[PDB]
Amino acid sequence: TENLYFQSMRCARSMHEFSAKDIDGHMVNLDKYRGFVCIVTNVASQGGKTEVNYTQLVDLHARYAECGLRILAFPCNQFGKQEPGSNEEIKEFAAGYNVKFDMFSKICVNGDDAHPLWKWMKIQPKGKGILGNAIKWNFTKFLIDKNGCVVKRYGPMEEPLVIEKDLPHYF
Numbered sequence: 232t233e234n235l236y237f238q239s240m241r242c243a244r245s246m247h248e249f250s251a252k253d254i255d256g257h258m259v260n261l262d263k264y265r266g267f268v269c270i271v272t273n274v275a276s277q278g279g280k281t282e283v284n285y286t287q288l289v290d291l292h293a294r295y296a297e298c299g300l301r302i303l304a305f306p307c308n309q310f311g312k313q314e315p316g317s318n319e320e321i322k323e324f325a326a327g328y329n330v331k332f333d334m335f336s337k338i339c340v341n342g343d344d345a346h347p348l349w350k351w352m353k354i355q356p357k358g359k360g361i362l363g364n365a366i367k368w369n370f371t372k373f374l375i376d377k378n379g380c381v382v383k384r385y386g387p388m389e390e391p392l393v394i395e396k397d398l399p400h401y402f
């Protein structure tokens with residue numbers, strides 16, 4: 232079972248209570264996203280849906296950054312080992328898609344070594360999965376409101392443009 236080891240954290244109210252290393256290795260306090268609507272997603276470079284996901288995320292960011300949309304991308308190698316490269320290589324991969332949103336260092340999203348933000352997101356009322364809460368594949372997406380609460384989860388079968396219709400409610 233996936234366990235928080237600071238059991239307090241089952242009572243965390245917001246993504247803004249968490250921190251993560253950016254793709255350059257620097258700690259980022261996620262409270263910087265207060266007042267912004269965020270899409271948080273796990274990414275891979277060698278996935279079957281890598282091209283559509285990066286392309287559409289870059290498009291949403293281009294079209295809605297000025298409305299308050301931010302995107303946090305977390306590389307993860309847990310799905311067919313489809314993100315095997317170094318953070319430096321992943322950074323250059325994203326640059327080829329002209330990514331202007333925020334890239335993070337590679338993490339686990341499932342299991343005992345999952346980043347705490349990911350452990351927390353999947354037990355939120357609106358972050359729950361269909362059969363259990365595990366992240367099922369690359370490019371699961373969580374929509375986070377301006378107060379840092381999880382408001383919707385989109386599975387790997389949902390391309391990022393599907394999210395577009397839901398954004399105006401949270402801006």
Ligand SMILES: [Cl-]
Pocket residue numbers: 275277278279280281369370
């Ligand atoms: Cl994929």
